[PDB]
Amino acid sequence: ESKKDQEEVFEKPTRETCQGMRHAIYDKLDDDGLIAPGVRVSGDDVIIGKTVTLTKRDCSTFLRTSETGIVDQVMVTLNQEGYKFCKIRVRSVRIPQIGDKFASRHGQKGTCGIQYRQEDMPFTCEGITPDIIINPH
Amino acid sequence: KSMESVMVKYDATVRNSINQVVQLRYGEDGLAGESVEFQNLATLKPSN
Amino acid sequence: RITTPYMTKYERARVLGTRALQIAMCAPVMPLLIAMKELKARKIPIIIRRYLPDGSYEDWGVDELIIT
Amino acid sequence: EEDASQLIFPKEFETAETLLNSEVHMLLEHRKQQNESAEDEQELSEVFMKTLNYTARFSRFKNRETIASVRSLLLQKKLHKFELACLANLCPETAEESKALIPSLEGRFEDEELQQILDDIQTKRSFQ
Amino acid sequence: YRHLALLCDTMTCRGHLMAITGCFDLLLDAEKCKYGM
Amino acid sequence: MFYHISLEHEILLHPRYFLNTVKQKLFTEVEGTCTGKYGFVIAVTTIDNIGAGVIQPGRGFVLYPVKYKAIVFRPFKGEVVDAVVTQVNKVGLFTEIGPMSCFISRHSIPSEMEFDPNSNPPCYKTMDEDIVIQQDDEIRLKIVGTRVDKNDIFAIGSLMDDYLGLV
Amino acid sequence: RTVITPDPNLSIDQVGVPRSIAANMTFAEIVTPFNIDRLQELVRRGNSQYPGAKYIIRRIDLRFHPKPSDLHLQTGYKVERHMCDGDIVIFMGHRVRILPWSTFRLNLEMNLHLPQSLETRAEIQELAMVPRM
Numbered sequence: 273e274s275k276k277d278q279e280e281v282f283e284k285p286t287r288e289t290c291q292g293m294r295h296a297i298y299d300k301l302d303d304d305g306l307i308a309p310g311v312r313v314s315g316d317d318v319i320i321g322k323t324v325t326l327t328k329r330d331c332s333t334f335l336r337t338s339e340t341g342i343v344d345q346v347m348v349t350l351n352q353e354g355y356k357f358c359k360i361r362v363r364s365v366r367i368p369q370i371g372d373k374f375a376s377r378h379g380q381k382g383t384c385g386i387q388y389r390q391e392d393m394p395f396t397c398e399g400i401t402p403d404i405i406i407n408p409h
Numbered sequence: 410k411s412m413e414s415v416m417v418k419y420d421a422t423v424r425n426s427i428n429q430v431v432q433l434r435y436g437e438d439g440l441a442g443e444s445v446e447f448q449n450l451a452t453l454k455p456s457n
Numbered sequence: 458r459i460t461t462p463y464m465t466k467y468e469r470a471r472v473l474g475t476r477a478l479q480i481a482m483c484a485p486v487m488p489l490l491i492a493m494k495e496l497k498a499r500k501i502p503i504i505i506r507r508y509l510p511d512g513s514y515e516d517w518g519v520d521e522l523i524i525t
Numbered sequence: 526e527e528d529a530s531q532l533i534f535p536k537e538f539e540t541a542e543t544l545l546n547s548e549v550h551m552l553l554e555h556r557k558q559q560n561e562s563a564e565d566e567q568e569l570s571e572v573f574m575k576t577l578n579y580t581a582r583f584s585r586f587k588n589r590e591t592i593a594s595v596r597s598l599l600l601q602k603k604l605h606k607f608e609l610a611c612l613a614n615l616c617p618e619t620a621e622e623s624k625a626l627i628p629s630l631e632g633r634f635e636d637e638e639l640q641q642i643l644d645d646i647q648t649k650r651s652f653q
Numbered sequence: 654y655r656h657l658a659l660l661c662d663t664m665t666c667r668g669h670l671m672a673i674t675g676c677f678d679l680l681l682d683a684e685k686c687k688y689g690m
Numbered sequence: 691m692f693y694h695i696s697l698e699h700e701i702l703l704h705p706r707y708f709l710n711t712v713k714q715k716l717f718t719e720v721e722g723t724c725t726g727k728y729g730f731v732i733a734v735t736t737i738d739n740i741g742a743g744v745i746q747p748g749r750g751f752v753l754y755p756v757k758y759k760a761i762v763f764r765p766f767k768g769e770v771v772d773a774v775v776t777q778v779n780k781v782g783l784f785t786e787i788g789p790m791s792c793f794i795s796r797h798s799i800p801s802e803m804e805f806d807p808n809s810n811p812p813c814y815k816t817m818d819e820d821i822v823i824q825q826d827d828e829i830r831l832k833i834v835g836t837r838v839d840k841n842d843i844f845a846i847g848s849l850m851d852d853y854l855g856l857v
Numbered sequence: 858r859t860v861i862t863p864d865p866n867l868s869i870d871q872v873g874v875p876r877s878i879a880a881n882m883t884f885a886e887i888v889t890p891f892n893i894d895r896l897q898e899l900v901r902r903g904n905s906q907y908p909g910a911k912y913i914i915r916r917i918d919l920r921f922h923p924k925p926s927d928l929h930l931q932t933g934y935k936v937e938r939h940m941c942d943g944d945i946v947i948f949m950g951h952r953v954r955i956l957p958w959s960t961f962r963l964n965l966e967m968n969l970h971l972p973q974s975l976e977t978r979a980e981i982q983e984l985a986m987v988p989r990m
Binding site for chain 3: 984
């Protein structure tokens with residue numbers, strides 16, 4: 273937040289009083305314009321509803337990359353100068369899909385080709401089915 | 410960028426952007442690149 | 458008559474690339490697989506205009522020519 | 526720079542020929558002959574319709590050789606075709622009125638040649 | 654060898670060595686186009 | 691003015707109609723254009739050649755360069771033509787030389803012929819009451835310059851020389 | 858733009874584009890008597906499901922407020938569907954088979970460019986398919 277004189281404050285934009293914005297629904301925003309932790313944000317919905325006061329212009333800060341995680345923590349402090357501040361930590365798990373890159377301690381970085389089943393992974397004489405098969409070559 | 414537009418025109422000469430003749434027949438006999446093999450002659454090599 | 462009596466592979470890209478275009482645009486049939494059959498049965502209403510590097514040209518039709 | 530009495534007719538206009546209101550009259554009805562064939566067709570332009578009435582009233586000659594002979598007696602003439610438009614549609618009957626309706630005839634052919642040949646045109650006019 | 658006789662023949666075209674740093678057309682055949690449904 | 695000359699033009703066929711189709715789309719398109727190079731287009735009499743149909747690179751439109759004879763109608767500077775009386779005003783006169791209209795400006799209007807509101811069409815008259823302009827008369831007017839308006843040309847009629855006025 | 862991953866069960870001139878990527882690209886199709894009875898399903902679904910279309914060049918943005926007065930489709934129009942199988946994309950020229958994850962499978966990153974006409978498609982087909990080079 274920076275007051276300057278066009279200044280801006282944390283708030284909640286109603287759709288038909290603030291200017292240009294997408295169809296990012298403002299359900300998740302609270303009474304003052306911050307998301308409380310424990311509210312699952314989807315791809316591209318408003319997390320901080322900041323408005324340069326002009327009628328007013330619109331300066332939302334979208335969730336980039338459309339990851340669909342969970343907002344985990346919000347702190348509200350002052351800056352160096354005396355202006356209110358906020359940091360937000362949107363967490364997401366990431367299950368290892370096809371693609372995510374693995375490597376041992378012995379060079380030879382590799383991908384993940386296909387994910388088989390315990391059903392299908394070749395079993396030993398004693399019911400061991402290895403987690404990972406690397407190429408001989 | 411040296412051979413950016415050296416082509417084979419319908420004379421089967423070898424011509425380019427500045428429309429000058431590079432070669433009169435393409436590759437010294439007109440034959441094409443990817444339809445030849447290695448063969449031997451057997452009149453050159455043996456004795457008299 | 459100094460041009461080659463066959464069809465070069467660049468004509469066949471531009472014959473069938475355009476003959477299938479007009480058949481897509483509501484023409485009389487004589488889209489891509491339609492024009493493959495017409496060339497290999499030799500029924501196409503296109504005359505190829507081959508220039509020469511002097512400035513001249515020679516106008517060939519497909520039935521005058523040996524297709525691949 | 527150009528003017529039709531200054532006679533700047535370029536090479537885009539040098540091959541041209543004036544047409545009478547009667548020479549247009551024998552041809553637009555040949556245009557309508559192609560319209561009466563393939564009947565109940567989408568009709569001709571309204572500019573043609575305004576031209577249809579402009580070649581209707583002002584037909585200064587009627588018979589097929591009458592339109593031709595006045596053209597051919599003036600094709601024997603060495604005066605310009607634009608100045609001829611006046612000689613057979615505007616029709617001065619005297620050489621003085623010919624020099625008055627066309628005041629760009631100065632420094633040119635004689636009065637008697639501009640009188641006698643125009644009075645030959647006045648003999649064969651299709652009056653009605 | 655055909656890829657060596659073109660590097661050797663674009664430098665030495667102009668008599669001295671230097672460093673470095675669709676022809677056809679189509680026509681619609683209307684006589685064939687009259688017949689054919 | 692009528693002149694029968696050569697004209698060069700090309701027709702853009704859509705592939706819905708794949709010779710005689712071309713000739714009847716020809717008379718639709720470019721009969722009646724306002725060209726500063728040749729004028730109005732009256733009619734086409736003769737057609738030289740049905741040219742070779744060149745397919746454009748892409749977009750499927752074949753194109754036929756067709757050469758043809760046609761009657762032009764251009765306004766020409768310095769042109770006295772008899773026209774038809776249609777409207778008379780102290781501002782001017784709006785008369786058609788066939789299909790092409792014309793204007794007669796106040797600098798060229800005679801100050802002798804005064805305005806005549808006595809006839810049921812407004813006109814100019816004399817004090818002799820024998821020369822009174824009626825409907826469908828012949829007026830002589832020079833074409834002094836082409837003033838093109840709404841992408842259409844009306845001529846500038848002049849009445850300041852020999853016989854320029856009423857017949 | 859995403860990873861390539863190996864996959865020996867595709868005939869060489871094939872690529873596996875996943876459904877989060879082929880549902881953004883378009884191949885603008887022009888209506889024939891063939892597809893006019895086929896594409897109306899793909900107009901009807903819209904942008905909600907995967908086999909749908911974005912634009913109808915009659916230019917109606919058919920992704921929100923569908924307006925069923927303007928679901929007309931006669932020949933000559935241009936419809937911009939998302940993707941299907943069998944279509945041709947550029948590196949050589951692959952062919953889209955759909956294998957649902959997040960990686961471009963091809964029988965041995967890269968972007969993906971898609972041509973937009975039935976002429977420059979067949980230039981790739983008879984000159985630059987993956988077997989042809």
